[PDB]
């Protein structure tokens, strides 16, 4: 269990895994016996990762008791789990930033569109006011006749 925890800590150090407002539950499901008593968010994530690996061992034992076919659980499975965790976290976060970037630009274009639409209201009335005086002056001069 200690070996799994140290592998998780070292490999997941690159990822953020930081929650400043993390709340420690009263009954923490402690898997790693050497986990700090007030565990951080990063430590909690690694603790869950270790628990996931030990879950498969219990699952395989359940099949053997029932008489089903079981496959060996090896550290390579744990390495695959953390590799997938690192890749999925980077992929999901990167897509979210790109998606929100495009949405932020799109909304900015919309708010500039409505602003220019309001600008057209002021342009329209200036054109209308100029038209009213133009025909009024044209009629007045055309009537000097």
């Amino acid at each position: 269990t200690e070996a799994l925890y140290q592998v998780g800590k070292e490999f997941t150090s690159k990822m953020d895994l930081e929650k400043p407002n993390y709340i420690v539950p009263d009954y923490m499901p402690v898997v790693y016996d050497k986990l700090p008593q007030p565990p951080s968010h990063r430590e909690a994530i690694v603790n869950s990762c270790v628990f996931v690996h030990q879950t498969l061992h219990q699952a395989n034992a359940r099949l053997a008791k029932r008489g089903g076919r079981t496959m060996a659980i090896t550290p390579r499975h744990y390495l695959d789990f953390i590799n997938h965790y690192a890749n999925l976290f980077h992929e999901k976060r990167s897509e979210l930033e790109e998606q929100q970037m495009h949405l932020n630009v799109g909304l900015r274009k919309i708010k500039e569109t409505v602003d220019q639409v309001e600008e057209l209201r002021r342009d329209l009335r200036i054109k209308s006011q100029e038209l009213e005086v133009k025909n009024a002056a044209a009629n007045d001069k055309l009537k000097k006749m």
Binding site: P25, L56, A59, I82, N87, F89, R93, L96, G106, L107
Partner: protein, 97 residues
């Protein structure tokens, strides 16, 4: 603009559950490959409960198949005579990632 604003305000919430969602998704790809659907759910349920007891945020509304693949990939897979099944969809995901 209404839909984009709604998605923009929830962006902060979505970023909070990335660690929990990815952890469940990574475990499913690496571990749940060999087992049948009956225990793929059992393994997922046990992991989800542990995250809940550890106060780790994760989205419980989206399906794992929906999370790990897009509609275009699923449509392309169906064009390759992939059966329209959740377990078959999960298997195709593991054959890609």
């Amino acid at each position: 603009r209404e839909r984009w604003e709604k998605t923009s305000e929830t962006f902060k919430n979505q970023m909070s559950t990335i660690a929990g969602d990815c952890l469940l998704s990574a475990a499913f790809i690496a571990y749940a490959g060999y087992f049948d659907q009956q225990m793929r759910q059992n393994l997922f349920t046990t992991w989800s409960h542990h995250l809940q007891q550890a106060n780790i945020q994760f989205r419980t509304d989206i399906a794992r198949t929906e999370y790990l693949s897009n509609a275009d990939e699923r449509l392309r897979w169906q064009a390759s005579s992939l059966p329209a099944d959740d377990l078959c969809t999960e298997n195709a995901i593991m054959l890609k990632r």
